[PDB]
Amino acid sequence: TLELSDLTIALEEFERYGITERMIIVLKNIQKIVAKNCNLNELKFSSLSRELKLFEELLKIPSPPEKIANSIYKINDILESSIREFKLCKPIQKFLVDFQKIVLEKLPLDKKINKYSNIATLEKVEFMKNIIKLLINWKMYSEAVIHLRELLIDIKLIENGKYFYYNNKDFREKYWMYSYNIVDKELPKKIEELLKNVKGWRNSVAHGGRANTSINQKTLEENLENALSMIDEILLSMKDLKVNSKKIYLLNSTIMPIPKDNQEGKFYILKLTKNEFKVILENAIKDDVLDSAIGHESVIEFIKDKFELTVPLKRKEIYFEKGESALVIKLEKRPEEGKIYTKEEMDFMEENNLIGYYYIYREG
Amino acid sequence: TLELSDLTIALEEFERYGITERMIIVLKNIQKIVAKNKLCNLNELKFSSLSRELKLFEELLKIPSPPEKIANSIYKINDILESSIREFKLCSKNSENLFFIKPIQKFLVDFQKIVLEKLPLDKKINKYSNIATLEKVEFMKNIIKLLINWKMYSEAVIHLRELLIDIKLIENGKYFYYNNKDFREKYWMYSYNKELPKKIEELLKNVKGWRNSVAHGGRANTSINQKTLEENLENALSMIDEILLSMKDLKVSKKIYLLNSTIMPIPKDNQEGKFYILKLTKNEFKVILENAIKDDVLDSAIGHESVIEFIKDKFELTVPLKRKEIYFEKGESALVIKLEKRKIYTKEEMDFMEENNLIGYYYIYREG
Amino acid sequence: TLELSDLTIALEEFERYGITERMIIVLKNIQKIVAKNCNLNELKFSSLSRELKLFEELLKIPSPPEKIANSIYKINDILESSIREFKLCKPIQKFLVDFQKIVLEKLPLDKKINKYSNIATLEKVEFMKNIIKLLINWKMYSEAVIHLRELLIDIKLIENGKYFYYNNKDFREKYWMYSYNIVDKELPKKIEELLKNVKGWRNSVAHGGRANTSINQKTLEENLENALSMIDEILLSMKDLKVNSKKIYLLNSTIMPIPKDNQEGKFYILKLTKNEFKVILENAIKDDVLDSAIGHESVIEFIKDKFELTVPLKRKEIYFEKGESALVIKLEKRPEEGKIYTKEEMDFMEENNLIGYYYIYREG
Amino acid sequence: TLELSDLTIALEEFERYGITERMIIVLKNIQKIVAKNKLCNLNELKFSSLSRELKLFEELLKIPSPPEKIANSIYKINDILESSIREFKLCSKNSENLFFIKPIQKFLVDFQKIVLEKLPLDKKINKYSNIATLEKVEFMKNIIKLLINWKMYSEAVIHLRELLIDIKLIENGKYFYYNNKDFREKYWMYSYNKELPKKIEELLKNVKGWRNSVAHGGRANTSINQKTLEENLENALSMIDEILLSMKDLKVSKKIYLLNSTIMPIPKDNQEGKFYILKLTKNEFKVILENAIKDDVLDSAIGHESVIEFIKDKFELTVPLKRKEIYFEKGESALVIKLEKRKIYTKEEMDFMEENNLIGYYYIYREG
Prior knowledge:
The structure is a homotetramer.
Chain A: H1 4-17, H2 21-34, H3 45-60, H4 65-87, H5 91-106, H6 122-137, H7 141-159, H8 169-177, H9 186-206, H10 217-238, E1 248-251, E2 264-272, H11 274-286, E3 290-292, H12 297-307, E4 325-331, H13 343-351, E5 355-362
Parallel strand pairs in A: 1-3, 1-4
Antiparallel strand pairs in A: 2-5, 4-5
PDB class: hydrolase
Keywords: type III CRISPR, self-limiting ribonuclease, ring nuclease, Csx1, Crn2, hydrolase
Assembly: tetrameric
């Protein structure tokens, strides 16, 4: 029953304000209509409409970057899948094609983000900068400012070698409240200037313009454009930049030893993805800060096999000093005695989450 | 001519999502039609101002803005709509002009139905732009309800926090700190040591429990979904409704002096004082002034009866004459009616002063 | 009945630990003994013993500098008075003489402090430095540290042109918590270094040495000696130093006008002594920041007569801008119409506190 | 020979004002007399150590110091005194030596009477130097009483604040944060939302009301006199006494694991954790360990029975054997007995390890 009219305005509403209601209505109708006839169930239009509703929700209610990136991935995937299966067999194909173009030109797509969902990364900062641009385009200004603050905190975390504090609320808040150690380098001053600038106006939005501090649309947009420009400059500076490392142990369990003369310790532990583990370890090797304490050669071979990295074998006790770190690979099943993990064993362990990866940091 | 499709979709998009773009397109089209046809002798200045106010109002919702600006914008929209409809109503009708009048009047009436059912309208908000008031809390409660309807969640949460600060200020008799950034922030951060204050504390604790899930972008695994956010907002709105009902009769009173200059005297006993001074509107002066009179807390030190006559004539309030020194104790207040040009001022001259901003109204509070 | 023994150890206890009990006992006995016979009542030994008890109290319980300075003044005065009246007419005279010497060599004496009891001054900083030395000599270490903190705050207040915030608890605390505007000059860096140094160890004493932060006597004494040395260097730097001034109005009432376009104001008012008024005004004239709004020539003549200062006559409205100040001279009695305050009138007004002096500062 | 004047005045000055200078002079004189006359075969090392401990003890009062140091010093003074008196007691007496023994023994006995009536003596404080304990709160209450007696007011107030922090830590089951500067400071700054916690809050509010009158030198017209300070301190000491009585029976329990290594596992469910680790004394391990046993909150994961035998033999406690993985949930704790050199360890070898600091005891707390 849908008139080409309905389709055109559903596309307009999505492209102009990110509104999904009319798109969802049109899509549920399309899948009901083709139910009469391209048969195969790669035509997951109901799942596409569901994902669209969820995506608009993750924009309207401030959500972690990982969730937004994931939603855009799922939408892109379901479109293509459905489009080919359908096309391959009316104006409906045209509508799906026009809708796809928008998606592909407005929604930022980084398929690698969730490989690194637990830590702050430059690619994530870039992605959230583009998402903030999208939010501004859809006139979601208050949301753009909320996300801008967290993006600035991420930049501070990355530059201070604190990417593993990405998900620690206390640490993020401490880093927003407090400034830099005044002791000289250009990049930290750029970052400080950006944070001072944004703090200059952020509460005009964040506090509803009370106490005669309101800000209008043109002013806010200029402020956001300048913040994004400064972010671009900073990201360019940081692309090749190397953040120095103190020691990184490699361990096969999650331990917190302190030196026997120490009275006290404060520790942080972060669960990692295998890709996060791979990147931390590769960097540790190439920066020559890895201090391996892996005793079992089955683990050395597991690492070589699954990550193409070579780690020295070393049976030793370790003790954390303040500021030292550790990578942990916890295999919950050792192999046959004096033997190699077989490929079936490695598959079973991965399939059933029997390999755990962690980052440990001694804060005190 | 106007396409009915276009008018219907502009109305639906505004009513459903608060979007004004298509409304503006339709209105500029009507403006061109009325300019071509000299229709009903209409003041096109006010149709053009309607387009302007609509764009501005959407901005004031999307960028969280003080309640006075939002309220004023809703007032102006209602005003222009009402006068435009009236002009079409009274316009002498004939066969030719009706072709254009019928759909244009219908569109304006339909738009007005949306405005009157969806936009909270309080015409006295802007009389009291410097102080916290119960009516303003009601207004911003209704604005938060509107924002929720249009799926404008983070804007709703920002305003919720400022509404709670307003409630705290009013209950502690600190309505004159409404526009003072530091004191708003102190009142949000800090608690107090009597049913109503427990109700208010209990709203603030509840909101603080989840507010940063939205205010901080849901990082560090604090994300919240739409169903939860909607439940939390509904709970806050209920607590606010109960609290407003309780607060209708409350009396927030210590002594309030009435002075004719901006003075800060302290007792000869005292080593130091901290004072706050707030410029008032003529309406703020008036309402603070009887409340002081009816509460029997007014302590007049107005010396010259030309000022007593200004007060009697322009506010219809009766104030005793008294030439006397006063000293502020900590926590005391004053209303000031200050002639901004310094013996006898005849009342005709004082009227001239009101005429030209030579009468200033102030609230003074000795905070320390 | 008192044995020369008792007198010697009372002197020893006072000189060594500031203990006054034995001195008070000896003094009450002396005045009871001479009650038999130098007759005249300048022999106020009971008042001297009372003052001694009060002075030990003002040392043992942290007290404002004005009170301690006053107690030392009273003690010095009562000693001399009593000594001459008595001497002029036994080993008792010898005891009074030995006691006087101690007082005159151990107790710091600045008779001008209380002329300026409401504001922070370099002479007061010097006096409290010498008092802290006294406290250390009498092994009153915890008291010395409490006083050291307030002395540092006073130095900060003086250097920032904030001497009138001397008695504002909020401002004093803000100045201790917070650092300097990093933007270059040598003296503020000296002050910052002193504050950073003292903050480095102060809580070792201030918090009872808990959480493994205790400090021993030799260490604390070294830290105190270094703090006092830094204070001496800073005082030398500041002796001729000139703290710049924004505008100072001269008013004849305590008013708080703000410009008609301003929405809001925050004001501070401090009650002054006539000497504080004289110094502020003299400085304002010589620095050419005085903006007089005194309309009545009787007031101009009062100021010339009582302070030997010349102030221009000017009838005008004023409005405070942020950061402007005012001196206020409030005469509660105007003179005979178009006439001069007679000398009897000025005396009566001073005698009965009918002249009030104030400092007003617009903080916001 | 000793002058009786000198001995009497040294005793009076110590008893009345806690001053030790003259005591030290008299004691060094006695030491010279005993060295000249080879008196009673006395160990002059311990008379010289008495002079040293007296100087040190005065320092530990005048410079506010942790309770462990003060307690240990009082113990050492009592110990040396008691043994010296005993040696004079048992010394075979004759006509010649008695001329020196009579006044020296009298002086030591008189000094001991002062020590035993005036210095609080708790010999087990130093067994538990890393944790907050009720006995330590009692000890520091008695030390504050002593300090007040000797007119050492600002020292008394500094200690009062730290005593209140200790009470807060104990009542919240956070005794292992005793030596953690940040958490002591957080617990002093922050309140809580049940009679005893209200009593404790009410002590803290009372003290905070006047504490800075002393802690900040009485500036900005906050000075306080001796009469007021004495009343305020007496009121605090009473509230502390009531609170200690209430707290005698309290049970502060969640689960406590027993582990043989310093591990920080979190559930595979969790993204992050924050852990605290505190090195313990053998006595702290022992007392925490039965309290866990008697409270039925111990969850043992000790795998090798050589460790079960170490525990049974050296602490006389019975602990089940269990080889198992554990995961800390937020708020869970563990006791750790760690062999500091990494299959089978015979018990004779483990004894050798205790011998030479190869056995470590730890408390682990998952704070987040």
